[PDB]
Amino acid sequence: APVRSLNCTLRDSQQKSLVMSGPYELKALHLQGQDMEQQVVFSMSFVQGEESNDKIPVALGLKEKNLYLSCVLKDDKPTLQLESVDPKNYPKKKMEKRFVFNKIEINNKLEFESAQFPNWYISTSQAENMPVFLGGTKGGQDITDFTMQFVSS
């Protein structure tokens, strides 16, 4: 296998789970009880980009779906969105910089910096039922740290 890929789930500092709101919308909320299995799993591909011992360049796409997380500028502001990439031409090792995330691990928590937008990480508000957006204030009010849980394929 030229490009390896694993599947894992992401949770915020409040232990919230990422769920698909609309076809191209992601939300972060508390998921417990027997509703935990509604969790969305993301596939991490070993792409090409800025690599280090702490920061690893990986792609983020929905498991068994051609929906990938993309970082673009909308109205002079960097925003996150879901792009429907070619189902037969994706994924690939050399992915577009807007689809390349810099998964860093400073301590026990992991941070996802955008390769397209340096110092901009995936953020989510502390509040419940809040959507996912791109923030440039890591360690501020909005959650900028996440967890990684490997699932069964």
């Epitope: 296998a1 599947n7 691990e105 301590n107 026990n108 967890t147 990684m148 849980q149 490997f150 394929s153």
Partner: single-chain antibody, 248 residues
Framework: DIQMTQSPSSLSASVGDRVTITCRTS??????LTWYQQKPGKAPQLLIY???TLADGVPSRFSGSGSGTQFTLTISSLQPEDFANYYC?????????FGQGTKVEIKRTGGGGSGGGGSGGGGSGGGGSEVQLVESGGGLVQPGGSLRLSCAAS????????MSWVRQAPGKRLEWVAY????????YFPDTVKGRFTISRDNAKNTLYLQMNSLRAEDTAVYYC????????????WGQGTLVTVSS
């Protein structure tokens, strides 16, 4: 998931022979293979890690090779003390299980007192550093019940070293149970054991607490304390193991 396949299961060689153990994976991990040695009645030890990296303190007669989807262990010179079960492992993704196990038997004609001595050196258990993990809490419990396993950590950094939990049923391979972060957040739990177990750590008493709820008959096995040492998911030190049996 990613299964493992070893060859052979058992073999007989002479003292000084070049033993070769083949290990195959169901997924092209490329370079994420681990090799462990479990002595009869003792705790398993990490001989080879990262596919081709020897452990610090491991005899030079132990060499590891392989790349891609095929790995091989090579013993430059098989000694009578090398009698044990060799189980490989992958640290790339789930389920983090071991192979079938390869047993190496030393075929000796008969030299009278052919065996060896003990283990240890100057300072062992006395004037010197000694890393030890002692688990407790095991016993016989009724199905559906609960049990709290505790592992005592000593001889090393408790807040600098991370650890995990692995179980091995009598006459079976080793299966991952859970991960217990030194920080206290990232909770790695496979869908298989998800919800069944819960981990907790005490930095004051230097002990790990494993809460086992809604135990099933398939949970019957030995629980060994596993410890890491880097940023990768590998164990370099195993505890003695606590036997847990669920019956009526």
């Amino acid at each position: 998931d990613i299964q493992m396949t070893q060859s052979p299961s058992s073999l007989s060689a002479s003292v000084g022979d070049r033993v070769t153990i083949t290990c195959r994976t169901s997924g092209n991990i490329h370079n994420y293979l681990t090799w462990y040695q479990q002595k009869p009645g003792k705790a398993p030890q990490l001989l080879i890690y990262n596919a081709k990296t020897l452990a610090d303190g491991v005899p030079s007669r132990f060499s590891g090779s392989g790349s891609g989807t095929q790995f091989t262990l090579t013993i430059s010179s098989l000694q009578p003390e090398d009698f044990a079960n060799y189980y490989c492992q992958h640290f790339w993704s789930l389920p983090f299980t071991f192979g079938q196990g390869t047993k190496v038997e030393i075929k000796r004609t008969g030299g009278g007192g052919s065996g060896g001595g003990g283990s240890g050196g100057g300072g062992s258990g006395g004037g010197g550093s000694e890393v030890q993990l002692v688990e407790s809490g095991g016993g016989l419990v009724q199905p559906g019940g609960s049990l709290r396993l505790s592992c005592a950590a000593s001889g090393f950094d408790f807040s600098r070293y991370d650890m995990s939990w692995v179980r091995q049923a009598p006459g079976k391979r080793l299966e991952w149970v859970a991960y217990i972060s030194s920080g206290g957040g990232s909770t790695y739990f496979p869908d298989t054991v998800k919800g069944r177990f819960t981990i907790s750590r005490d930095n004051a008493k230097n002990t790990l607490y494993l809460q086992m709820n809604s135990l099933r008959a398939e949970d019957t096995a030995v629980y060994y304390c596993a410890r890491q040492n880097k940023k990768l998911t590998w164990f370099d030190y195993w505890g003695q193991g606590t036997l847990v049996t669920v019956s009526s």
